[PDB]
Structure formats: C-alpha cells, structure tokens
Design a protein around this nucleic acid. Structure first.
Lengths: 177, 143, 206, 262
RNA sequence: UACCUGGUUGAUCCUGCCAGUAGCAUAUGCUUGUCUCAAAGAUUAAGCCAUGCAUGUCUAAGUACGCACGGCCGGUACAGUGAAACUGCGAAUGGCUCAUUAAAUCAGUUAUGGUUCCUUUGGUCGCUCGACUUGGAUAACUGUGGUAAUUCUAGAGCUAAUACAUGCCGACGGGCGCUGACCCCCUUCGCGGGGGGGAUGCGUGCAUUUAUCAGUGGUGACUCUAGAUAACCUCGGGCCGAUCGCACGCGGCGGCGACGACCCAUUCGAACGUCUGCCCUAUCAACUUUCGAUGGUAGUCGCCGUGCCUACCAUGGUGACCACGGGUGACGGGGAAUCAGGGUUCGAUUCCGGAGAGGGAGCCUGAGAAACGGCUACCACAUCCAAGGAAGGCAGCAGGCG
RNA sequence: AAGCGUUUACUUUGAAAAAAUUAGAGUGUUCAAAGCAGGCCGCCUGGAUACCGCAGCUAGGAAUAAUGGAAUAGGACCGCG
RNA sequence: AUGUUGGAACAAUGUAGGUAAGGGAAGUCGGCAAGCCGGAUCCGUAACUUCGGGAUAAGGAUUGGCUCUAAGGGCUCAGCC
C-alpha cells in the first residue's frame, strides 16, 4: 500500500480520493473512491523507501553518480527553445531544434524532428488577418443596415404624419357639416 | 388600520418619500372585460396578493362558485357543485369540490351565499390557487 | 440531504401521502448562508442549469440608496438593530433581506457638502481642519452661483433623517437577497418608513 | 426518465411520414433545429422513402456527405435534419429544386419548383422583439432572428425572405380575403381565403377560412399561415391545390381515371 | 343468429338452484404428414447467481520526437500511416421488470406572466480609451519497484495543447456629457438678467445588484421589452479568438472551412399547477394540528410559484355527495375477450407516461442521476486470501439453481 | 365590417383532438391469415375515411328541467338643477 | 453544659452506623433484615370495573450556574410606580 504525502501518521488509513490526489487513478469524471494508504512518518514497518539525493557527496558511488542517463525528449514549444539557447525574440528558432539521429538494422538511417508548438507562421498570421476582416465586416454591416433602417424610419415618417393630417382635416370637415 | 405586523408593509412599486415642496397608490387593470372596483383605487388596504394592488397575474381557466366559509383571514372557502354522468345508469350524482380562494379586501361587503367568480393564477399557498375577481350578490336579500 | 418536496407532507383534508419514489435531485435544498459582519468571504456554489450562486458568509459594505436625492453610495455596515422575521437574528447579527442595519454617514454626508455644500451633522463649535469642504462651500463662479442658489430650494431635510446624521449612524433596510447574489444592497429608511421602526426599536428597548 | 430522449419508435412516428411498420422497430429520430419534431420531415425520409434514390440508411449517409444537398441556402450533411415547411431543398447535380409543400391530405407533397422560385421563401413571423439598443427584431417560423425589419410587420404576418442574402423582400398583411395555408390539424393542407376573424381573449382566436370551392371551414390562428393577397398566391401550387373535396368523389375520380385510359 | 335442455312429484304448474351448451386463455394427456405468421421464466421467488457478452468513440482540419510501419526533394520543423496517452463527447439513451403506489401514478384540457436547458438553427459578440502570440506543469516513454492479488499503483528524468492560468498593439481619431479654468456680446449708474463658447481630467460595450423617473414596440392583463439618472463589477472575479486544415492571387490584405466561447430567440426536454375522471371495505364516522395541521405577514432555501422550511400571529382545513383509515391476488391508460341492446371480466406484456436495479440512506461529475453495466457507508447474501488484506450485485441477452 | 346585448343543463355544429388497435376504401401475399403496395408501354398513382365519448373551448336554438327581476320600491326611461 | 463522674488506651465479643471486586436470593420455613425507587416539569398509562376508579398504574426525557428575550399589572396616548 503506497504512503501518502502529508497524512501525519505512521500506520495505515483509508481515505476518499478524488482527481488530483496521489495514489489514485480516476476512470469516470468526478469519480471518487476509498483507498488504503500508509502513513508518512517512516518506521520499521516499511518495505521500499524512495530516496532522492539532493546534494552529491565527495565520495562517488558507482551505481548512480557514474551512470549518465540523459534527457528523454527535446524541447518542443517555440518559446522554450528561446530560453534554452538564450536567444532573442526576433531571430528564427526553427534551426535550433533539438533533433535526434535514428539508426537501426532493417531501416535506412533517418532523422526525426518534433513539431514546434506556438510558432509564428504565415498560416496563423493569415488566420489573424482573417478574423480582423470579420471585425471590418461586422462594423460596416451594422453601420450599413442601421443607416438603411434610419433612412427607412424616415421613409415611413413622412407617410405616417401626412396621413395624420388627413384625420385632422376630416375632424374639422365633419364638424363643419 | 394598517401596519399591525412586525415589518413595514407597503406597495413595492411606488416610492412614498420623494421631496415635497395622499399616496400615489398603485393599481392595475386585470383584463377579460373585468372592471376594477372603486374601493381598490380609493382604499387604503395594501396586500401583495390582491389582483389589482398586488403582483399576481390572472391566467388560465375562470370559474365560479358559492362562498361557504369566511372565518379565515384574507382567504375564503368556496363551493362548486356539478353532476357526473355515469354511462351504465343513465343518471347523475351530486358532487362538490370546496377549494380555497383568496379574498382581496377590496371587496368589502361579501356575504356567505354570494355567487363568487374566481380566476386561476400562480399558487398562493399550499392549496390556494384561485383569487376573487368579482362578487355577484346572492339571490334576493334586499334587506 | 434536506429536500424541498410537497409529497412528503399531508393532504389538504389531512390524510397522509405515501411516497412512490425516493428523493430526487431537483428537489434539493441546501443549508442557509447566514452571513454576518466582517471582511468579504463569499463562497460560490453551482446550482441547477450549470449556473452560479454566491453564498455570502461575511459582509461589510453595501450599495445602499437614498431615494429622495436620487443618489446611492457604497458605505460600510456597522450594526444590526432590527429584523422583522426573528429576534434571534438581531442578537446573532445576521443579514438577510429586509434587515434594519446601521451604516456610517460620511459617504452620504460629503455628498450633501459637495453637491449642495451646506452644514449637515457638524455639531456647532468645531470647524473642519482638513479645510477641503470649506473650500467647496465657497469659491463658485458668478454664472454658476445662480444655479447653485437654486439648489437651496430643495435643500431641506427631515429632522428624523437629520438626527441620525448627527451621530453618524444611519438606519437602512436590506433590499437585495444576500445568500444568493452575494451582495448586500438596500436603501435608507425615510419618513413614514423610518418612523415605523423607531417606534418598534423603542418597543424593543422599553 | 433522467434526461432527453434520443431514440424514436416506428409506432410513435407521426402518421404523415407514412413509414411502414414491418421494416424496423425504430424510426429516424429527427435532429434538433429550426422546426419541431412532429411536423418536420427528416432528410433521410425525403431521400430514401419519398424520392427512392436510396435503399438503406448507409446509402443515405454517403449521399448527404457528397455535398450535393443544399437545404434553403446552406448545405447540411445530417441525415435527420428537420426539414420543415417550405424548406427549399436544392439539388445541384440534377438542377432540380424541391420546396416542401403540403398536399391536400396531411402528407408533405413532392413539389418541384423552378430555379427562379428557389431563391425566395415565405416565413411566418412570431413576435416583434426590441433589442438591447432599441433594435426591432422578428422571429420567423424557422427561428430567423431578423434585426431591423419593416416596422409595419405585425405579430402574425408573413415575410418573403431572400435566401442568398438572408433578408426580406416584401410582406403580406394579415387581412380578410387573403389566401391562406392551414398548417395543422384535421384541416391540414387546406388552401382558402380568409373570411372571418373571431376574437377570444385568454383563449385561442379562431379564424374562418373560405375554400376556393366555397367549402367554408374554421381553424384556430395557431395553425394558420397566409400565402398571398386575394386570390393570387406567391408560390407555385401542387395538384389538388388544397381543397379536400369529400371522399365520395375521389372514388369517382380514381374510377374515372382508370376507365378513360384503359 | 336476440336460442336452450335434463333433474324435487303417484302424476301437474311454478319458484328455485344444480348439472349439461358454446366462446376465451393457462396448465396437462393422447396423437401429428406440409407450409406461412407468431407468443414464450409475468402469475409461486422485485428469489440467488458460476461463466461469456451487452458503451464506447478521429476527421485534410486539438495535441505525432512510440521507426511500430514507412517516401527521400530535406536540413525550411513535422512526407504520410500509426499503437498508446492527454484532451473533447457520449455514457442520464436503449433493455428488463411491475416490487412500491388508490386524485397518488396515469388519461383528456390548459399554464409557466412561476421556471431551467445539452445539442441544433438564426442572430449578436474593433463599440470598452490602456501582441509577428505569454507562462509552467503533466500524460505516452526510459528506468527503479512493492503487494498473493485488483482496471492497485509509489519514486526519479523528462516532453505538447482546442487541458490549465494570464493578457494587449489595434478598432482609437476622436465624439457625448459633468467638473468646468477662463473668455466674448447685449442691456442696466450699479449688483443683476439673457445668449454662448471653453483647455484639463473623469465616466461612457454588453453583463450582475440597488434606488428613482417618463412611455420604440406587444400581451386579455406587467412590476414586460426598450429609455434616462445614481452607483456596483462577486478574487470561492462574466465575457469581449493568445486554435487547427485546404487552395493560395495581389507593406500587408483576400477565398473555402472546422473548432471555440458571452448573450438573445429556436428545437429539445425536465418540473410544478389548473378542471374532470379510480377497485372493495362502516365489524373504518369523525379525521387533521402547535413534531405544519389550514391560512396571514416577514424572511431562508430552491431554477422559480408555494408551510418547502423558519420566526411571529388567526384557529383554522376535510367529511354522510363516504372524509380519515384498512385491504388490494392494484403500475395506469391506449386497449383484449365477450356480448342483439345494454353489460361482465382482464390489461405483468412490445406504444405512451411513472418506479427500480438485493433493502434503505447520502453524494461526486455532468446541462440533465440522488445514476447503481458510478461511488460512499449500514443491513442480508456471497467471493479470493499468504489471515496481513481485497473485491460483488443478470427485475440487461444467453445460461445455471430454487 | 367591429363591439355589447340573463345564466345554465340540453340539442346541433366547428376546432383541438399520438400512433398501434377497432370499423372500413383500394390492392390477386396465386387464396387467406397477412402487408401497404403496385400497374403500363419513364408515366400513373396510393399509403383514405370514421369516432375519440366522459371532461374542457367556441358558434345556432329557446321546447323541456332549473335560478332571478319592482309591492318598506335604493323600480325602469326622459330632460335635468 | 451534653443529662446521677472523669482520664488513658483502640483487643476480641458486643449495640448503633456505613462501605464492599464478580455472581445476584444459589441463604433462609419464609427476600427476615438490608437494598432499589423517591421532589418537580413535559409525554405516556393496561387488564378489570359496582364506570366513581385502578393511577403517581407500568414505562420514558429534563433538572446546575451565567447572560438575554417575551408574556402576564396600577396611577395621570406617553411618562411614572
């Protein structure tokens, strides 16, 4: 049974765990389940302890301080390339991609490269230029149709008040008979 | 006369404390050809459940019945009589349904036996879903 | 949990209903907010339809209104004196809709001393040491003085409303519902509305 | 239940679709849209069951996504689209245009309209809505929220909108003597002039409609849809022209048609 | 097709019942050559279940550095497939059963002006006065492992978003008002009256809340929608594109789209009400209540109307027209059998609506569940165990026992 | 042309009135139970119609069966002051 | 002034008071003796009956202190006792 960060005991307890909690893998959305977890204070009732060396000592262990395990993946986002090589915000960072060589029997020697994410390209710039056309389309259309309606509202206004004078003239003509 | 509770009852729509140098009483029409009573306009009763000085809208069915009980305050109990046809025996049977109807105090002189006309609206209480629209006088009773 | 269902209780005639289903989710009821006086601590809760309700628990200020002068300002609430629903909501100072509370007068007093610039409150004997309102009382333009002099036609105030301006504590009624929208807005008692609770508060004291 | 329905039984399908009950237990459940479930006709029914281009449901699936079906100015690729009253379903491949018009019975009639007729359709407005900045709005039968309309259009008038631009051209005032289309009930599919309006406050107003052959009848205003002024319609009319001549003479016409040709 | 027959007597005519007669299922016995439809664990056990299956899902268009395949025109990044995984949606539909339930469900009729809303459709979304695209985690993977064991996961390096927070150049150059510096003109001996302009700043998009005031457009009727003034902008802050794919024609603009949201109508539901309708029972005639019973006031909570609940009041409300209560071998209806005419009986059963997943109760997520082919506990039953612990709900299709 | 003109029960009419089932139109599933097709040298067509009582809405009638008018006149009309 | 005296010791048997782990009448002719309950407030209360009773039947809950609120009155609507 895995032990839980910050439980303030040394025995074993059962806790309700939701998404975001340690030692739990949800399957449904908002799923909650009881999980038996061990205490955080270490005593002689343990089997395996995960230990992380922060500061290397002057002695050199052959198992860990000698075996070099490099990075697994190269940086992928466009802005994370700039901070790795201390580049500026104006130069091109596409040629500074961290690619790897590929060599094995049965296949030709190829080279694979990651896709640079959040990088400025003419397709995005065209798409940015596409949505400002809609803003120009919207603002022109509201001004065109409201002025047409305001002209239309003036169009009805001359006929509505002209026919108002027909009733008022009738109101005097009927009273004259 | 009024304001005998813990709180201050008043018409919520109007404002009665504007700068000065009677009350601008709120009243609304109801529709369906029903004439609003004189006492609602000129009276000093205030009630949120009144169909003329309150926030209730009359919709749905319009019924009528005879009033049988008035010991309850601000609401009354009416009686409706009808006959149910049985298809086996070609006869009828007297069945009555006595629902609770809110009585706005705009109608002042209402007597037991008057043929009341009610109107459907939102449920005012657990059983009250009907409000008085007009009070027709009982047969005869000139004294 | 606590639920809002009509079928759990008796009939009109007095007979007992027998349930045919368990508790439904749309009949849900929640514990009361019971907000008090303090720094702003409002908890948002999801409600039916994927909406939000603001469960206030501690509130200090509110956008009360003074309707005769057509002005409203945000002022801090200090005390609760009267509640019509229950007397235990006065001892335990709880804010719900239609509560008679006490507020400071300086947000409204300065508006009288700026837009009209006349002495309100200000028990005679002491003059303003910051001198800002004294500057605002005088030094008007000659063409705007006539417009300023027409502002004194309606510069009269009722004695009861002026009396609570003396101590700086105004009686005001809560109009907004606090546990749902989270705010504590309302209005100041005036005239017939104001004199009614003054009889009731005196009856509360005795 | 615990939510909205998603299936549809074949028995529970409306009678005007005329789907046979021996084929399948289920019915094509119409997707939501500008028309209600019952009086609409899904695009799968109009193709497979009305026009008989398609045989199975997978065959309907492929044709609709070839982008060959253009309903009232916009291509929809859903097989169960709620094609309501007079949706101008335009087919580009054969140059043919369909407008969904009711027959003399309650069924939708397969009416071919001319291409110049396919550019306009008649929509019944529902309410005059004031927008957030004093903006008049009209809501049609297919929920077309048209802002800045003509101010003289009232609650139950009809507007001759234009499909390629989405704007109105003319409108017909609701008045006695104008042509009408009875959209609902026992008189479903009737065409006649309006002769009498009866007012019922609180209840539903009923309007008497005089048929072209003098067969006057009544219908409530909720199932009433004007189509033109006087005796002049604004669209093309199918055979029968919405008369509902009584069943004594459909016996005569069906018998006379067989013996005349031989 | 609206129909009878035998039987009490020594024999007669009646009443009277019994038994024959014909339908309709349910079981069962004997027997059976062909073909077309079609019911089938409802009745006692809504009793218990070995095992197998029944809800998963990718387009050119959200993430592609898994060679797991594979093209060579590459250094201008990913040719293009592609397991997995993050993300999005569905999983609240359908299926089974009829246990509970007697104005209750449900059926006909209306209302939501008393409400919430996934998806779809049609509209809005440079309006606000201050960026050629921000940030850091993490899954897959490498590798260390534990437990007898779970669809158990623990630790260490990493690496992306249509996952998570953040936010602007522009439109934006100025308009409207309020402070209003200060100025001009006329007239008055003179203060005074009127006509005006005005630097500066502030506020000014929609959205939430409070207060106040006049009627663009409607409803049978608004405290409707719109309009104006005064403030408010929920930090457990409301938005106002910090997305992707195909052609590409001319300092930057254009066509075809998908996705994404704020808001309004639309579709779609859900939910409460309104009038009428329900089996038997009096060896059930009075019932309901200060432990809400029926109304009033003020609030809480709720999506909203409401004793739904609370606090203060009135003593009210139903009933012999059967209230209340009990039984029901009662899910209700559309309908089925059977009848000249009327009626009787049935309706577990394919369509509609309600209830449930062994019995209660409570809850997470989600628009929608009090979901159980979702969890959390108790009760009853049952499973593996290394004895430490873990794990289940066939009234879903089969199937097994009773 | 629009509105108001004692109220009902009752009678007539119209709308609103899920399908399936019921009666019933057409149709040689070779017949029939069934099903909604099909027939002619592309066309012709169908997939009707009936009731939905009982309850509720609307419209003609005034016989029958109910309730009521003014007799301490606060009675009905016409001008009124 | 402790009942017609005092002082010092604190042994058994006594007389008069008490307390006892576990069991709870197995003791004894016999629950003898001892022990349980106990006042007040709010619920609730059977068989039987001569309808008056049984009945405080039986069986349950509460009780302290402190700080407040409300109600129940006299003298001229408010004040004062």
């Amino acid at each position: 049974f895995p032990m839980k960060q910050g439980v303030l005991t040394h025995g074993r307890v059962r806790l309700l765990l939701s998404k975001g909690h340690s030692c739990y893998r949800p399957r449904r959305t908002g799923e909650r389940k009881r999980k038996s977890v061990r205490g955080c204070i270490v005593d002689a009732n343990l089997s395996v302890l995960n230990l992380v060396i922060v500061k290397k000592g002057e002695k050199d262990i052959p198992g860990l301080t000698d075996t070099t395990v490099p990075r697994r993946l190269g940086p992928k986002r466009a802005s994370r390339i700039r901070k790795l090589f201390n580049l500026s915000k104006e130069d091109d960072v596409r040629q500074y991609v961290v690619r790897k060589p590929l060599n094995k029997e049965g296949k030709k020697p190829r080279t694979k490269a990651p896709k640079i994410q959040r990088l400025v390209t003419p397709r995005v710039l065209q798409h940015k230029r596409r949505r400002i056309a809609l803003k120009k389309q919207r603002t022109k259309k509201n001004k065109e149709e409201a002025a047409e309606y305001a002209k239309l509202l003036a169009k009805r206004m001359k006929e509505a008040k002209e026919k108002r004078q027909e009733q008022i003239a009738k109101r005097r003509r009927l009273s004259s008979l | 006369d009024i304001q005998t509770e813990r709180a201050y009852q008043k018409q919520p729509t109007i404002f009665q404390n504007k700068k000065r140098v009677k009350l601008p009483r709120y009243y609304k029409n109801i529709g369906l050809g029903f004439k609003t009573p004189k006492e609602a306009i000129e009276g000093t009763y205030i009630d949120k459940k009144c169909p003329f000085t309150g926030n209730v809208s009359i919709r749905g069915r319009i019924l009528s019945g005879v009033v049988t009980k008035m010991k309850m305050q601000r609401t009354i109990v009416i009686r409706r009589d009808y006959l149910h046809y049985i298809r086996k025996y070609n006869r009828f049977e007297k069945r009555h349904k006595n629902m609770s109807v809110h009585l706005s105090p705009c109608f002042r002189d209402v007597q037991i036996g008057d043929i009341v006309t009610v109107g459907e609206c939102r449920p005012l209480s657990k059983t009250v879903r009907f409000n008085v629209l007009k009070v027709t006088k009982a047969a005869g009773t000139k004294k | 949990g606590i639920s809002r269902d009509n079928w759990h209780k008796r009939r009109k005639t007095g007979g007992k209903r027998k349930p045919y289903h368990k508790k439904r989710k749309y009949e849900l009821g929640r514990p009361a907010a019971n907000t008090k006086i303090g720094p702003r601590r409002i908890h948002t809760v999801r409600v039916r339809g994927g909406n939000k309700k603001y469960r206030a628990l501690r509130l200090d200020v509110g956008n009360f209104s003074w309707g005769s002068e057509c002005c409203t300002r945000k002022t801090r609430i200090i005390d609760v004196v009267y509640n019509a629903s229950n007397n235990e909501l006065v001892r335990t100072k709880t804010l719900v809709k239609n509560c008679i509370v006490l507020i400071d007068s300086t947000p409204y007093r300065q508006w009288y001393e700026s837009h009209y610039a006349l002495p309100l409150g200000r028990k005679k004997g002491a003059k303003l040491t910051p001198e800002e309102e004294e500057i605002l009382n005088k030094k008007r333009s000659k063409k705007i003085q006539k417009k300023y002099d027409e502002r004194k036609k309606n510069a009269k105030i009722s004695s009861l409303l002026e009396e609570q301006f003396q101590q700086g504590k105004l009686l005001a009624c809560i109009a907004s519902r606090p546990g749902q929208c989270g705010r504590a807005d309302g209005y100041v008692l005036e005239g017939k509305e104001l004199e009614f609770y003054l009889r009731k508060i005196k009856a509360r004291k005795g | 239940a615990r939510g909205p329905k998603k299936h549809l039984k074949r028995v529970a399908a409306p009678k005007h679709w005329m789907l046979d009950k021996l084929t399948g237990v289920f019915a094509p459940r119409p997707s939501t849209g500008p028309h209600k479930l019952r009086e609409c006709l899904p695009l799968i029914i109009f193709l497979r069951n009305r026009l008989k281009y398609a045989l199975t449901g997978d065959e309907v699936k492929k044709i609709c996504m070839q982008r060959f079906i253009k309903i009232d100015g916009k291509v929809r690729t859903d097989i169960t689209y709620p094609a309501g009253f007079m949706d101008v379903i335009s087919i580009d491949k054969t140059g043919e245009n369909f407008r969904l018009i009711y027959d003399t019975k309650g069924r939708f009639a397969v009416h071919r309209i001319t291409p110049e007729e396919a550019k306009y359709k008649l929509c019944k407005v529902r309410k005059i809505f004031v927008g957030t900045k004093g903006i008049p709005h009209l809501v049609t039968h297919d929920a077309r929220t048209i802002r800045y309309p003509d101010p003289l259009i009232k609650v139950n008038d009809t507007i001759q909108i234009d499909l390629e631009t989405g704007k109105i051209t003319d409108f017909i005032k609701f008045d006695t003597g104008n042509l009408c289309m009875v959209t609902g009930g026992a008189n479903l599919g009737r065409i006649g002039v309006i002769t009498n309006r009866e007012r019922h406050p609180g209840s539903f107003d009923v309007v008497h409609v005089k048929d072209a052959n003098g067969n006057s009848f009544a219908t409530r205003l909720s199932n009433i849809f004007v189509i033109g002024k006087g005796n002049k319609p604004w669209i093309s009319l199918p055979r029968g022209k919405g008369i509902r001549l009584t069943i004594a003479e459909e016996r005569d016409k069906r018998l006379a048609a067989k013996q005349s040709s031989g």
